[PDB]
A paper describes a structure:
CT and LT, with their five equivalent binding subunits, are known to be multivalent proteins. Binding has been described as a “two-fingered grip”, provided by the two terminal residues, galactose (Gal) and sialic acid (NeuAc). The specificity of this interaction is mainly determined by the terminal galactose residue, which is buried in a deep pocket at the rugged underside of the toxin (distant from the A-subunit). As expected, all three inhibitors bind in the primary binding site, acting as decoys for the toxins’ main receptor, the [name] ganglioside.
All three toxins have the same amino acid sequence in the primary binding site, and they have essentially identical 3D structures. pLTB forms crystals under a wider range of conditions than CTB, and the [name] mutation makes the primary binding site identical to that of CTB. The toxin complex with inhibitor 3 was solved to a resolution of 1.6 Å in space group P212121 with one B-pentamer in the asymmetric unit. The inhibitor was present in all five binding sites, and binds in the same manner as 2, with the galactose residue binding to Glu51, Gln61, Asn90 and Lys91, and the sialic acid residue interacting with Glu11 and His13. The benzylamido extension, the feature distinguishing this inhibitor from 2, is flexible and sometimes adopts different conformations. Interestingly, in two of the binding sites, the inhibitor is stretched out and links two adjacent toxin pentamers. In these two cases, the sialic acid moiety extends into the sialic acid binding site of another B-pentamer, creating a cross-over with another ligand. The inhibitor solution was a mixture of two stereoisomers, as indicated by the waved line in Fig. 1. Hence, our data show that the presence of inhibitor 3 shifted the equilibrium towards CTB-dimers (“decamers”). The small increase in oligomerization in solution (20%) measured with SAXS is likely not sufficient to be medically relevant, and the stronger cross-linking effect in cristallo was probably selected for by crystallization.
Author numbering:
A (entry chain E), B (entry chain D), C (entry chain C), D (entry chain B), E (entry chain A): 1 to 103
The structure:
Amino acid sequence: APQTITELCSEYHNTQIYTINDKILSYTESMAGKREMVIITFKSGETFQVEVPGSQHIDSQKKAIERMKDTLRITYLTETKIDKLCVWNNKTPNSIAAISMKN
Amino acid sequence: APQTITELCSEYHNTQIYTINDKILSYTESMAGKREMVIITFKSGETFQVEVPGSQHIDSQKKAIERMKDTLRITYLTETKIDKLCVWNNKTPNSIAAISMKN
Amino acid sequence: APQTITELCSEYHNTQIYTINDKILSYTESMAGKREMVIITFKSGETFQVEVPGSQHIDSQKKAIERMKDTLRITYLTETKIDKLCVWNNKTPNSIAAISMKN
Amino acid sequence: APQTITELCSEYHNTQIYTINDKILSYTESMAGKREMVIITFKSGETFQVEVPGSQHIDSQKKAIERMKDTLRITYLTETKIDKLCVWNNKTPNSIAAISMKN
Amino acid sequence: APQTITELCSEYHNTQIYTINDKILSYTESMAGKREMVIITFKSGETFQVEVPGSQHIDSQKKAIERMKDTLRITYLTETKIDKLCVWNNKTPNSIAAISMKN
Ligand SMILES: CC(=O)N[C@H]1[C@H]([C@H](O)[C@H](O)CO)O[C@](C(=O)O)(n2cc(C[C@@H](NC(=O)Cc3ccccc3)C(=O)NCC[C@@H]3O[C@H](CO)[C@H](O)[C@H](O)[C@H]3O)nn2)C[C@@H]1O
Ligand SMILES: CC(=O)N[C@H]1[C@H]([C@H](O)[C@H](O)CO)O[C@](C(=O)O)(n2cc(C[C@H](NC(=O)Cc3ccccc3)C(=O)NCC[C@@H]3O[C@H](CO)[C@H](O)[C@H](O)[C@H]3O)nn2)C[C@@H]1O
Ligand SMILES: CC(=O)N[C@H]1[C@H]([C@H](O)[C@H](O)CO)O[C@](C(=O)O)(n2cc(C[C@H](NC(=O)Cc3ccccc3)C(=O)NCC[C@@H]3O[C@H](CO)[C@H](O)[C@H](O)[C@H]3O)nn2)C[C@@H]1O
Ligand SMILES: CC(=O)N[C@H]1[C@H]([C@H](O)[C@H](O)CO)O[C@](C(=O)O)(n2cc(C[C@H](NC(=O)Cc3ccccc3)C(=O)NCC[C@@H]3O[C@H](CO)[C@H](O)[C@H](O)[C@H]3O)nn2)C[C@@H]1O
Ligand SMILES: CC(=O)N[C@H]1[C@H]([C@H](O)[C@H](O)CO)O[C@](C(=O)O)(n2cc(C[C@H](NC(=O)Cc3ccccc3)C(=O)NCC[C@@H]3O[C@H](CO)[C@H](O)[C@H](O)[C@H]3O)nn2)C[C@@H]1O
């Protein structure tokens, strides 16, 4: 298996690593139907989403999507600094695949 | 997908944005049958609910309804400031569709 | 829908509001079979339970029962003050239907 | 229903009450197959388990077993004092049936 | 059942104990498909994973794998010191079977 977020992100088409080194500026959460998603921003001006579950996802991703949203909320609430994100850049806003945090 | 709560809120009939910019004043949670709901209030005087799950909800909202109740509880307990709420205004109290918070 | 815990509680037979205005004194949790329950006490002397799930509970209550127990544990550990409880008084200890907290 | 952990514990065969009045000393958690369990210890020298789910458990205990482990982890991480444990003493280490804590 | 992490770790082939005695340096979490996993590092330079659920796992492990990832996240955010890890050493990074923490 991969040993770092970069190694992992490189295993996928249409991804890139963003170097964030910052806490989340804003957290947005929706339970509106067809828009069950989370959006985060940073003071850098970047916006990212956890996508609505959809037919591009495989069954093993369902719990992982929910875990990612849980991680983003508690990261936000604790002002925990994020190191890097692995995103898919064929979505607007870019779509989160992985997160790393360092202390 | 949308990039802000206001953009997302505009994709729905019977909504409006409330700019709260405050912590939650009170949190009420019920497990009584047919009233399995959360109610929050603000010192502004506004009251909002997460509705009981019903026939208007689609299957993709079931986990999101539970997540939103989770977010309101921890928001209340940590005195985290809410920025905006997207609410459905065809319910009393108005019904939460989305939340945003910024720091 | 109701806008306060008192309005809500008044929708049911065999209920009453306790105005506690205090943190939980003790928290007890059991996973013993047929006693899968939580019991809380207050220094004023009151003792309340979240009942074991049973045939009096409708399906929509199953998640809500689990949520209430979640809520009681984190309220206890954070020494958060409970304002009101709505309880059923046809069970001993009286059984929690809803809780409110204000800050 | 019972009003105290000791009343509850007395309904069961093969149990006893340990009065600990202390934080947990160590927390061990395993996801190794057939050993999906938590082990806690205390400075007084006692070791206790939450048992692996098994054919001795009834279905209502499955969510309760998971809750108990949730509770032991957060209790460990917060240094929260445990007051009493009701344990089954026909297992080695003795097996947790209920827990209480007071503030 | 076992009473220590070491005793438990010895009930499996392809395992060893690492004595960490340290908090987690980095936390990495992925929802990318077929890489739904968590990776941790320490300032020692070791790296460990919770593996993607796979056909080597038995059904009783599915909730435990999710629990272990929950534990690692909160352990990381709280700066909690880990005492030992039991890991499978036939994977790269080595794969977490059990964790212990003492205070
Ligand atoms: C406490 C206990 O019950 N311990 C036993 C342990 C568990 O039953 C088992 O690990 C749970 O699945 O199974 C042990 C163990 O050492 O892991 N075990 C497992 C095995 C099966 C063996 N392989 C198969 O079943 C595939 C196979 C199919 C057909 C024919 C031949 C091979 C096996 O090693 N299973 C565990 C594999 C490990 O899974 C781990 C996660 O659970 C990690 O991912 C490891 O990296 C991986 O090697 N045999 N013995 C024997 C231990 O004494
Ligand atoms: C580690 C690993 O397994 N990585 C592999 C990766 C995963 O297997 C896959 O993403 C898991 O679902 O699958 C890779 C990938 O880069 O994502 N992949 C996937 C695909 C095709 C595949 N397209 C289809 O299955 C539609 C299709 C159906 C029938 C016939 C033809 C097309 C595809 O790109 N799937 C991922 C789509 C991405 O999903 C993401 C969420 O998981 C995001 O939403 C992205 O914005 C979206 O592009 N091509 N390469 C190749 C890569 O090696
Ligand atoms: C982003 C997106 O997909 N937005 C679309 C939105 C969603 O598809 C829909 O809300 C998702 O369920 O559906 C829109 C909308 O504005 O909500 N839509 C939907 C409808 C009719 C549709 N009527 C039915 O589902 C029948 C029905 C009514 C009541 C009970 C049981 C069954 C309807 O308004 N659905 C939403 C109802 C609202 O649900 C909300 C919870 O999700 C709140 O409870 C509201 O108070 C309630 O009005 N008209 N417009 C159009 C909008 O474009
Ligand atoms: C054709 C038709 O519509 N028939 C319906 C029937 C009639 O409307 C009713 O019988 C007319 O009086 O009403 C039915 C019925 O089963 O009688 N009905 C009745 C109820 C009220 C419903 N009865 C049950 O949930 C079943 C039950 C109660 C107690 C012990 C064990 C099981 C009721 O009052 N539940 C609340 C009971 C309270 O539950 C609380 C937890 O939620 C606390 O534990 C309280 O301590 C407890 O008193 N809900 N549905 C449903 C049935 O479908
Ligand atoms: C006519 C009659 O009532 N016969 C019944 C019989 C008697 O009630 C019993 O022998 C009288 O003492 O008790 C029977 C028996 O076979 O002896 N019995 C006894 C038990 C053990 C019994 N099981 C149940 O009560 C659940 C259950 C109910 C109904 C059917 C099956 C399971 C029991 O001792 N459960 C607790 C075991 C403890 O579980 C704990 C966790 O929950 C810990 O792990 C403890 O270490 C463990 O000892 N299971 N079946 C079933 C039998 O049908």
